[PDB]
Amino acid sequence: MAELACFCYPHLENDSYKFIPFNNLAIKAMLTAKVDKKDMDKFYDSIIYGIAPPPQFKKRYNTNDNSRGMNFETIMFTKVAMLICEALNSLKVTQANVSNVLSRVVSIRHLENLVIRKENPQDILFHSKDLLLKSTLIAIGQSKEIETTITAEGGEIVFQNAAFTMWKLTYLEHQLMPILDQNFIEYKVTLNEDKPISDVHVKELVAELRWQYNKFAVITHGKGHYRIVKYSSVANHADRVYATFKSNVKTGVNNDFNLLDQRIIWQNWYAFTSSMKQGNTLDVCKRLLFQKMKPEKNPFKGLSTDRKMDEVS
Amino acid sequence: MAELACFCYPHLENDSYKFIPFNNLAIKAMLTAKVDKKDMDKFYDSIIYGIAPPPQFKKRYNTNDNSRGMNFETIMFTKVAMLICEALNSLKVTQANVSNVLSRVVSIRHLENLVIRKENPQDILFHSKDLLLKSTLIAIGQSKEIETTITAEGGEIVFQNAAFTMWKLTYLEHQLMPILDQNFIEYKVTLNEDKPISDVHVKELVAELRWQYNKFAVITHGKGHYRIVKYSSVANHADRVYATFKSNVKTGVNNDFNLLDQRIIWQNWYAFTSSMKQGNTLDVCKRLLFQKMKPEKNPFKGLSTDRKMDEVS
Amino acid sequence: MAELACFCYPHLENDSYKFIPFNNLAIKAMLTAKVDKKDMDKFYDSIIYGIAPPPQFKKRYNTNDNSRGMNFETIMFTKVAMLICEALNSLKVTQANVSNVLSRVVSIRHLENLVIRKENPQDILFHSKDLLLKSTLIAIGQSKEIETTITAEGGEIVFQNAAFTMWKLTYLEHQLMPILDQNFIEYKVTLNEDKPISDVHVKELVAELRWQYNKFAVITHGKGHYRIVKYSSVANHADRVYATFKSNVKTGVNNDFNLLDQRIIWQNWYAFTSSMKQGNTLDVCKRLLFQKMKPEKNPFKGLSTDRKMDEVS
Amino acid sequence: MAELACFCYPHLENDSYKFIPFNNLAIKAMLTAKVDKKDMDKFYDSIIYGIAPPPQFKKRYNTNDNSRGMNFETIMFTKVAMLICEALNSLKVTQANVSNVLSRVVSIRHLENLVIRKENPQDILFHSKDLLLKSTLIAIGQSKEIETTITAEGGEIVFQNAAFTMWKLTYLEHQLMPILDQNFIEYKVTLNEDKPISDVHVKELVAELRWQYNKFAVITHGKGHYRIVKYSSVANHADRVYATFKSNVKTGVNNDFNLLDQRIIWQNWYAFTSSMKQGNTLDVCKRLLFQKMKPEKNPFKGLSTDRKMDEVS
Amino acid sequence: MAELACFCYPHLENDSYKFIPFNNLAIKAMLTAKVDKKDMDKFYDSIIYGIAPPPQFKKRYNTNDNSRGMNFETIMFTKVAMLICEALNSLKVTQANVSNVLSRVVSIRHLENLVIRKENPQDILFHSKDLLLKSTLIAIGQSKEIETTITAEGGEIVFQNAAFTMWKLTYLEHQLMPILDQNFIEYKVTLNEDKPISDVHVKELVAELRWQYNKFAVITHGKGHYRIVKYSSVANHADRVYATFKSNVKTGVNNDFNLLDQRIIWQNWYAFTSSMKQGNTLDVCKRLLFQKMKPEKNPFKGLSTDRKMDEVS
Amino acid sequence: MAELACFCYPHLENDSYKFIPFNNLAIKAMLTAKVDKKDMDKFYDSIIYGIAPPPQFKKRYNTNDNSRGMNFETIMFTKVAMLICEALNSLKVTQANVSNVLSRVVSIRHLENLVIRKENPQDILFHSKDLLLKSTLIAIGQSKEIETTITAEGGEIVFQNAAFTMWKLTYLEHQLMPILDQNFIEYKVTLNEDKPISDVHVKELVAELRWQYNKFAVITHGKGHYRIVKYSSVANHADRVYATFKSNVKTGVNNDFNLLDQRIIWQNWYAFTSSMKQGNTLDVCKRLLFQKMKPEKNPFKGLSTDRKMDEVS
């Protein structure tokens, strides 16, 4: 969850910027360097191991006194760095742009998962370079396309339907930047196709979530996919999503928010999400998250009893 | 889940029957003995290791070709055997009785759990011999008293209320006769007191079951406690409980069946249980288990939303 | 012991059906899919890992709740799948046929053993692709040829003669679909050549079986080889073989049954086998298995004493 | 299989010989001592660890260059030594006797097995000191009584009948003096009572040996028990038993030889044994072991088929 | 220490005999084959693993009941077999010869050691194919040349001089056919050149043997090298060497015996060796081994004191 | 090899000095204390763990920067300290004496060995408190008696005779203060009795040393026992022994030097030892150690050949 400039540096060679991966030992030398305030934002030169990241990004790397960062000495760091370089290098980047592109903060977990997909012979990304790139560009925030099943970050499939695919996010097992809270459990449901979805398929997906995931809120962060988070967490996803919309106060931050099927999404989340998409203060939105309601609680009232009955037999 | 005569043999000494534990090596010799059909029901004499169980009970002991029995060579076997002997010996048994008493088929798991309770200094049974005996006599089917929290078989407490105590049955981890199916999960809820229970406490217990155990049926086997079994199993608990009632065709089998709070017990189970307690064929009862219904589904309609809401905050 | 459609799917490419192996992850996604009754018999499309087997074949794959199936996540699964594909692909299959061919239920153990033979440099199948194919086609039930030593499924050789080869079936050690009963012991004797066999060689083979395998029945399942099963099992081999003959009630099921040398085969089995090959009910046949007899017990009366005498010296 | 003087030394104290165990370190010092030919037969005095065995018995103790002896540094050595001392000390021995008693060569294995019986709470010898002594005195050759089940050396019971008990000799697992040949397998059948034995019981025992031990000769060494040795060994048991009878050329060697039930014992062994008990040269006896015969091969002709038939069902 | 026909079989192909290595599995099948006395001397045909050695050579292969043979299932067996094949194949062998050549009994240890030399990049044999062959042909007894340092079997160098090289034979650590006696210790001294050796160099070598190997006899088996065996063994080397000379009773057994420097060789061994080389009975020779003498005990009387003195300083 | 005041401190209680063991933690606190030059020779007071040794003895305890000392945190330290206290406490010590007694430098190895003897039930010291004390007082230098077999420091017996006992000093394996040089090998020969020794016994002992220990010098340090040190070490034993005699320049240092049997002791050592015992400078003595000689080299000329001959047979 760091800046792209934490994995590579721009090198205007052969008439265009080609991004290059950092050596961890170079990062390690940087971490011990005495730097002037005037250069904290510049790429560092260890002499022995090549260029290192801007000293200001110190907090992004785990050290003897920092567990809030990433494990840049792992093999995964190199992999993810290369994964990023391969993507940014296909985007003939221009001078005035390199800066912004690299300051783009992205999800390292999302990147580690794609590396896990592409290195596996069974996964489609292993064979399609084109697919791997669309997927990476989406994750690097350098693409208009929305993430779907085919280009999903990955994880374990625990439910698949003609219209959806549910993945279990394996964050606890990550090498680069793992979730440290062992109580962590999160899933996401991606659309297999953006075309219309029958009520039949929605119903199936709503049933699986009601029976196998009763203790999980069904929300979304605006992109085109559902996020299955436990209720003890929604409040924070709220703060987070709102703060991102809040950053709309920056032209170019064109933020189309897609509040998915109102029959799938959790009632309160639909509320909170719409008040926000309308222009209300965090407090107005937030309150709707806690105000108990009643309606829209029976979109497909009866799904629960059915699955249960099927089990009985 | 074998006969009491599988752990000990009667010895009319010092003017009364005192029960004695078997040595596993004696059982082992028995298992290799060539016996006459006329003696399959008699206690066996190895010469080296004392008396062994009746050769007819061969199927009750695991061997190179039997995993349906118990692990009599474990330490737990001796413990459970002693636990039984200590109980039967406090019941000055008479001749005409020894036979019946020992043929009483009992739950070995229930017995292993009590051994686990009594050997632990923190558990009340460790200190009260009287309590340990009431508990054992209940489990040995030689007592009128109903099992309650204080005298429960044991397990892990995953919920306790002013009126109830929910235990997780640790059968997978048993030494003597473990459940072999790794998919096994079962809990039971015992009453802390037999006195009246407020709607407040029932409501709490119904809420915990609806949120933390949504995929479990809330039934009972007639005694005074609830059994939290997963729906994919109720059908068999049905066959089982009915066959036991079926054995009512044997005077002395006075079978008072207690179908606990209708607001707690699963709807269908209340149905199935009552048709049986009324005198209907298995088929009549059974059918009610699968016939979807509607009412009595809202005893405390709203519990679910509440817990969820509490989580959100 | 599953259908061929459990390891691969047909792909009519480059003007003919070429069979392709499944990825286990694709099988894994299938296992979580919600499918319509109308498609249970169709090949499944995970999106990430290619085509998966027909959802109806769910029971064929071990899962958290199934030990009756196979271990498709093992390396052996891929090997066996490839082994099958290599064979079916040499059989330019036509449309109307692909269906039937793939529904052919076969012995996975037989296939795992051939993989074990072909991967070993010392074994002839390692060097002869032609031999490996004859062997595989025999095992896949897509060949008229009978299995002989040269094309045997494999195992450990515990006796070899000018005319026969006895193998110990290593089923307990299999990776894909192992026999779970640790009491399992089975051997098979294959003919090194189909030409005539002298009384000298038969006698040797009958002696070895009488001395080293006294507790084993010498039977056959109709193909051209002997099966050394322990007597506590013949009854089931009976049910099995008969049910297969029973399936003769399906033209095309041309079932020539070869009841091998009457001096080698177990007396009762010769009986039971002939009554069946004559057209009698299971019960008529079956009874002959238990009816003690006398004659044909001295084909080479004296073999026993000889071996014993040789040992004494 | 060494002299009793290899485990203890006589100490005429408190007006009678009381035998004392050796310390292994004392034995170890002895093994390095330079001794005069005149003292090779005398008890050795290390100074640090007490009395050691007569230097002539050097070959009886394993060393860096001897695996033909015993492992006197094991705990079992002390145990067996004590076991012997406890027995010899109950036999108020007189001067002229100590010498002979200690020169008595005995079976160490037989002694290690009794230690294994007496140390086990389940075994009768653990509780009866009287029984343990009868057993030990029998094994030490200082008793007229014959060894029976109750006083058997021990082992694993693999068959028990109203009249017999079959034990598997665990020699490979011994600590003191183990059989080194991993191909070793031997059993012995002891009589539970010396009273008459019905044909019913003999028949059962003969059936078990014919089915479960077809590759074993049923012989005896003259005492009152059967020895189940594999045929590849009888020849040596022959040499051995004969050489012992040969030592009859020493008054006091009163050797009553009991050639057990002629229907149980192996035909040839009955022959060989009787020729010897008659006064013939080894060669005359020996020859009968290899001369194939016919009769007395059907004592209970039919036992074999029966067991087999029982298996089939 | 088996026949060459224990590692390979002749194959007259491409107009000349080319020797081929056995597969261990083929040897394993052979070991279970029932063969006619008429074929015990013929090459065996397993069907699955190629040709196997002549069944008469059964005793040469370790099995569950033979530790006197070799470990043919090891990797070393294949290596040694190849090592032999590479050598015999450079010797365009003729029909009438193949038989004799293969019946040549050779030292497996000697062969395993050469494999150890040739596989090591530091050793000269690794680089010179010519050298490796001279060495192998010497060891296979198909060469007139005498073994010297350059072509030595190998081992650890524990002393090297301008004229000699002393090796420690690592037999205990061998994979194919290790010495089983853990008390085993043997060395050999090879000549670096066959040219004359000054008294200076002989003296050095005699000093090293007197100080560092005082407990070892300095003998020779007739070839051109010394063997440092402990005195507790000379007696057997005597029997052995004599029996070999004894086999002189077979023209073609041209046995030139080289009894090396009389100042180096042990006095008695020089005696025993010369009586033999003269034509005396074993008994005449043998006696000289035990008859204490005096002279020739001071070839370089004083060597001992010198080394000692050098140590003191 | 430290001062006695390194293991205990004097406590004049109950009217006499009773010595008490140090706690290692107290020693550890001492090692960190800042002490005045005026108190380096005084007993230290940690407050938490009792009295500690005089800070001047710092070098005697191993630390992160000292491997020249002992391992006072081991269990052996406490044992040895107690062993010393038990001995000094039986010596009702007076004021003016405590000081000198405790400053007595002694061999820690010698003490660790006695602990090893007394803790072993097989060793005589385990049973005789009187013997253990004589032994300890000898080792503590607070006794006139000479060390003999019965009171030897201990080790492994590798040779015992009617007159002597040879021990292998196990210094490498010590816990408290081990010899760090892995090349270390030393033995000592103690007299079993101080009475006269026949030429027979001396001869045996001289033979064993000449054959089994040819590379060892046979010397002595003045006490009544031989020390078998390798020649590469005598030079230092020389420096050492002389420096001790040198300390004769201190009345009370009554140093009777016993230069044992001149036929046993090494020639040069007898020389060097006598020149010293005569009053010559180190240089005069020393030179005799290197001057090669001739006579007295044949005390029992012929021993060597004999042992060798015995081996040959």
C308–D231 CB contact, under 8 Å: yes
The answer, yes or no, to whether E and F have at least 3 beta-carbon pairs within 8 Å is yes
C233 known ligand binder:
no
Three-state secondary structure string covering B239-259:
HHHHHHHHCCCCCCCCCCCCC
Obtained via which technique?
A: X-ray
Q: Could you tell me which residues of A are annotated as the binding site?
A: 107-109, 188, 221-223, 227
Task: For tokens 């229970």, name the residue.
Answer: B197
Q: Quick one: C122 exposed, middle or buried, by C-beta within 10 A (0-12, 13-18, 19+)?
A: middle
Task: For tokens 């000898």, name the residue.
Answer: F138
Is C91 within 8 Å of C104 (Cβ atoms)?
Answer: no
Query: Can you tell me the distance from the alpha carbon of A70 to that of A72, in angstroms, rounded to the nearest whole number?
Result: 6
DSSP string for chain F: --BGGGTEEEEEETTEEEEEEPPHHHHHHHTT----GGGTTS-EE-SSS-EE--GGGGGGB-BTTBSSSB-TTSHHHHHHHHHHHHHHTTS---HHHHHHHHH-B--HHHHHHHHHHHT-TTSHHHH-HHHHHHHHHHHTT--SSPP-GGG----EEEEE-SSEEEEE--GGG-SSS----TT--EEEEEES-SS---HHHHHHHHHHHHHH-TTEEEEE-SSSSEEEEEHHHHHHHHHHHHHHHHTTSSTT---------TTTS-HHHHHHHHHHHHT--HHHHHHHHHS---SSS-TTTTHHHHHHHHHH-
E60 known ligand binder:
no
DSSP 8-class letter at C229: E
Contacts of F311 in chain E (CB under 8 A): 215, 230-232
Query: Can you tell me the distance from the alpha carbon of C33 to that of B207, in angstroms, rounded to the nearest whole number?
Result: 31
Tokens of E67: 């530790």
Which of D264, D285, D287, D256 lies closest to D273, judged by CA? D285
The catalytic residues of C are 225
Task: Please state, in angstroms and as integers, the Cα–Cα distance from residue A283 to each residue in A290, B278, C305, following that order.
Answer: 11, 59, 99
C188 known ligand binder:
yes
Is F195 within 8 Å of F148 (Cβ atoms)?
Answer: no
Positive or negative CA dihedral for A51, A56, A61, A64? Answer: positive
Query: Can you tell me the distance from the alpha carbon of E67 to that of E10, in angstroms, rounded to the nearest whole number?
Result: 28
Residue E104 neighbours by CB under 8 Å, 6+ apart: E3, E4, E140, E141, E142
Strands (E), chain E: 8-13, 16-21, 44-45, 51-52, 156-160, 164-168, 186-191, 216-220, 226-230
Query: Can you tell me the distance from the alpha carbon of B134 to that of B121, in angstroms, rounded to the nearest whole number?
Result: 18
Residue of A nearest to C25 (CA): A122
Query: Can you tell me the distance from the alpha carbon of C141 to that of C106, in angstroms, rounded to the nearest whole number?
Result: 7
F237 is catalytic: no
Estimate to the nearest angstrom the gap between the alpha carbon of D17 and the chain centroid. 26
E188 known ligand binder:
yes
Q: Quick one: C299 exposed, middle or buried, by C-beta within 10 A (0-12, 13-18, 19+)?
A: middle
Amino acid identity of residue F40, one-letter, is M
Three-state secondary structure string covering D133-162:
HHHHHHHCCCCCCCCCHHHCCCCEEEEECC
Query: Can you tell me the distance from the alpha carbon of B169 to that of B150, in angstroms, rounded to the nearest whole number?
Result: 16
Is F218 within 8 Å of E308 (Cβ atoms)?
Answer: no
Assigned CATH topology for domain C152-312: HIT family, subunit A (3.30.428)
Q: What separation, in Å, do the N-terminal and C-terminal C-alpha atoms of chain A show?
A: 47
C150–E47 CB contact, under 8 Å: yes
Task: Please state, in angstroms and as integers, the Cα–Cα distance from residue A249 to each residue in A246, A253, A257, C21, E181, following that order.
Answer: 6, 8, 15, 53, 88
Cβ-nearest to F292 among E211, E297, E305: E305
Contacts of A309 in chain B (CB under 8 A): 290, 292
Query: What length does chain A have?
Result: 313
Tokens of C162: 């000018």
D123–B48 CB contact, under 8 Å: yes
Query: Can you tell me the distance from the alpha carbon of F229 to that of F227, in angstroms, rounded to the nearest whole number?
Result: 6
Contacts of B64 in chain C (CB under 8 A): 182-183
Tokens of E244: 């070999």
Chain F positions with Cβ closer than 8 Å to E: 211-212, 214-215, 217, 230-232, 234-235, 268, 289-290, 292, 297, 305-306, 308-309, 311-313
Query: Can you tell me the distance from the alpha carbon of B267 to that of B293, in angstroms, rounded to the nearest whole number?
Result: 8
Query: Can you tell me the distance from the alpha carbon of F187 to that of F229, in angstroms, rounded to the nearest whole number?
Result: 7
Tokens of F62: 């191993």
Q: What are phi and psi of F159, to 5 degrees?
A: -175, 130
Residue D174 neighbours by CB under 8 Å, 6+ apart: D76, D109, D112
Tokens of C265: 């085969």
Which of C161, C160, C36, C24 lies closest to C80, judged by CA? C24
Task: Please state, in angstroms and as integers, the Cα–Cα distance from residue B95 to each residue in B12, B51, B99, following that order.
Answer: 9, 19, 8
CATH code for F1-145?
3.90.1400.10
Residue of B nearest to A231 (CA): B312
Tokens of D125: 């010898």
Contacts of D187 in chain B (CB under 8 A): none
Amino acid identity of residue F39, one-letter, is D
Kind and range of the H or E element at C8?
A: strand C8-13
Task: Please state, in angstroms and as integers, the Cα–Cα distance from residue B252 to each residue in B245, B249, B255, following that order.
Answer: 12, 9, 9
Query: Can you tell me the distance from the alpha carbon of A283 to that of A280, in angstroms, rounded to the nearest whole number?
Result: 8
Using CB atoms, which chains have 3+ pairs under 8 A with F? D, E
F188 known ligand binder:
yes
How far F286 CA sits from the closest chain E CA (Å)?
Answer: 11
Cα angle value F274/F277/F279 (rounded, 5°) = 110
Contacts of C149 in chain E (CB under 8 A): 47-48
Kindly list the domain boundaries of chain A, sorted by start residue. 1-145, 152-312
Which of C313, A203, C286, E42 lies closest to D312, judged by CA? C286
Residue of C nearest to B181 (CA): C65
Is C50 within 8 Å of C27 (Cβ atoms)?
Answer: no
How far E35 CA sits from the closest chain C CA (Å)?
Answer: 7
Shared fold status for D1-145 and D152-312: no
Task: Please state, in angstroms and as integers, the Cα–Cα distance from residue F185 to each residue in E172, F169, F179, F228, F233, following that order.
Answer: 25, 7, 10, 9, 10
